[PDB]
Amino acid sequence: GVEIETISPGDGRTFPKKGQTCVVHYTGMLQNGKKFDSSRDRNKPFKFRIGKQEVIKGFEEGAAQMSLGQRAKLTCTPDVAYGATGHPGVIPPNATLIFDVELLNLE
């Protein structure tokens, strides 16, 4: 389940396709918790491609549903990334992940 809450500006037509290296200013957030990851900190805005299962399903499905300039807000379910397993130290099991996702991409 990928629930999109878009902050309005963008173009609404430049959608990511397969094999397109796309650039996202992501900002992670735990529900009722602090941050855990941010591209604003490293200032290397995570040039990743679409269709190789590199990113999690709650972030990959949110990327194709956005366009250039758009600023959505992810609500990632636990069972797509870390709900059963959980990362040691960062993301616990059964965690509902929140992301501040803006798609200012290339290709």
Author numbering: 1 to 107
How did the manuscript describe this experimental structure?
RyRs are calcium-activated calcium channels critical to excitation/contraction coupling in heart and skeletal muscle. Ca2+, ATP, and caffeine are well-characterized activators of RyR, synergistically activating the channel by inducing a rotation of its activation core and pore opening. We use cryo-EM single-particle snapshots of ryanodine receptor type 1 (RyR1) to exemplify the discovery process facilitated, and the new insights revealed by our approach. Broadly speaking, conformational changes along CC1 involve the cytoplasmic shell, the activation core, and the pore; those along CC2 involve only the cytoplasmic shell.
The rapid decrease in conformational energy and binding affinity between states 2 and 3 implies minimal protein conformational changes during the Ca2+ association. As illustrated further in Supplementary Fig. 4, the binding affinity of Ca2+ to each one of the cryo-EM models calculated by MCCE reveals that the energy cost of switching between the +ligand and –ligand landscapes is initially high, but rapidly decreases as the interlandscape transition region is approached. Information from at least six structures along the functional route on the energy landscapes was needed to identify a thermally accessible pathway by MD-based piecewise free-energy simulations (see “Methods”).
